[PDB]
């Protein structure tokens, strides 16, 4: 069956078209809503056709945040068409987006089940590109809020990673109070355990530092049973926060008394054939206070992915490595002067 | 469940289980 639809280009201009597409399959079903696999008919070329139910009186979040994103690691909203609702204020939304066949999750599970690491150059450029999205998105005030191996996509041939899956993202604002019940447990930032609503765009951090753990390691880093047991599973590494740590992450919540309880060596924490840099930059993003660590652009530019600034650097498939300094002034705005330290001599304009 | 994470968090016993719950097991 080929679906004919009247859509609307997601970047812009707002001049509907029409757009037709072909086999169409389920690939993912949630609360959410339901994600589609599709072909369009004029280019041939695979999409996601993701469809949530919306109110006609609202805005839709995740659309509103789609049509402003412009950027080389975050899945293109392409078109975006209504359908339908039956009830009064009840119509779908859907968004078809770039399709892209792999994920962190999957290529991680791959080698995890071989019983091996991916290889340390993978960690760097997934790493990297995961951070880039992140100071991209954050520049405009919009947190993920739901960093996963999931949620990383992957082009298995040219190492491209994008950002998907804006389902829980917000534009945060400051004073205004955000849902402390956010996040895939085990990504979940101990600010949030801790029931903080004012939580900034670095429990995104977090969750990247997680996800960076979780491929050195072969499994979760911390694994928790529950929203108690992952403070548990937290505590086994970091410790117990210190008072300052506590009022730092929420400055409501008060405990009185508690037994401490030392940090484990983040050496130990790892095998011991680990990047000894690649366990530097973990131990600055998995920190108890929200503002020590580090900010994505800070996270690029630390010497962890020095080697994808080599000019010799390629792929082990042989490839060259994707466009990895193309900043702009928008990703670069957080910290305009580090652009120097991004932009490798080679990389400049001739 | 979720209502003991938010009681533990009302209360200010977070910490003290968490380090409960470690020594336990
Ligand atoms: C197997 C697989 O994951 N395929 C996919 N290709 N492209 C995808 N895009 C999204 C997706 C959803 C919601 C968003 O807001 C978004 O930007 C992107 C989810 C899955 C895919």
């Known amino acids: ?350 | 469940p979720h209502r003991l994470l938010q009681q533990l968090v009302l209360s200010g016993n977070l910490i003290k289980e968490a380090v409960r719950r470690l020594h336990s097991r």
């Not at chain 1, 029409?18 to 079903?29: L, P, R």
């Not at chain 1, 399709?99 to 599970?109: D, G, H, K, N, S």
Request: charged fraction near 25%.
């Open chain 1, 1 to 350: 069956k080929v679906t004919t639809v009247v859509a609307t280009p997601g970047q812009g201009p707002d001049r509907p078209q029409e757009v037709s597409y072909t086999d169409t399959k389920v690939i993912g079903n949630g609360s959410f809503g339901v994600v589609y696999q599709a072909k369009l008919c004029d280019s041939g070329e695979l999409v996601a056709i993701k469809k949530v139910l919306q109110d006609k009186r609202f805005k839709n979040r995740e659309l509103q945040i789609m049509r402003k994103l412009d950027h080389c690691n975050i899945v293109r909203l392409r078109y975006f068409f209504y359908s339908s609702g039956e009830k009064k204020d009840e119509v779908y939304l859907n968004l078809v987006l770039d399709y892209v066949p792999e994920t962190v999750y999957r290529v991680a599970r791959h080698y995890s089940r071989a019983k091996q690491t991916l290889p340390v150059i993978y960690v760097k450029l997934y790493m990297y590109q995961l951070f880039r999205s992140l100071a991209y998105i954050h520049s405009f005030g919009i947190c993920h809020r739901d960093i996963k191996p999931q949620n990383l996509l992957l082009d298995p041939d040219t190492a491209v990673l994008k950002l998907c899956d804006f389902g829980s993202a917000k534009q945060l604002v400051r004073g205004e109070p955000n849902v402390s019940y956010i996040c895939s447990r085990y990504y979940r930032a101990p600010e949030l355990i801790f029931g903080a609503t004012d939580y900034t765009s670095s429990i995104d951090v977090w969750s990247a530092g997680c996800v960076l753990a979780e491929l050195l390691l072969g499994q979760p880093i911390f694994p928790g049973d529950s929203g108690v047991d992952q403070l548990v599973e937290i505590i086994k590494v970091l410790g117990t926060p210190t008072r300052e740590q506590i009022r730092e992450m929420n400055p409501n919540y008060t405990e009185f008394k508690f037994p401490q309880i030392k940090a484990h060596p983040w050496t130990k924490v790892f095998r011991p054939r680990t990047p000894p840099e690649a366990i530097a930059l973990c131990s600055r993003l998995l920190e108890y206070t929200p503002t020590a660590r580090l900010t994505p652009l800070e996270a690029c530019a630390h010497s962890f992915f020095d080697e994808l600034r080599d000019p010799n650097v390629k792929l082990p498939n042989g490839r060259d490595t994707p466009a990895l300094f193309n900043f702009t002034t928008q990703e670069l705005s957080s910290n305009p002067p580090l652009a120097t330290i991004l932009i490798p001599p080679h990389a400049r304009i001739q």
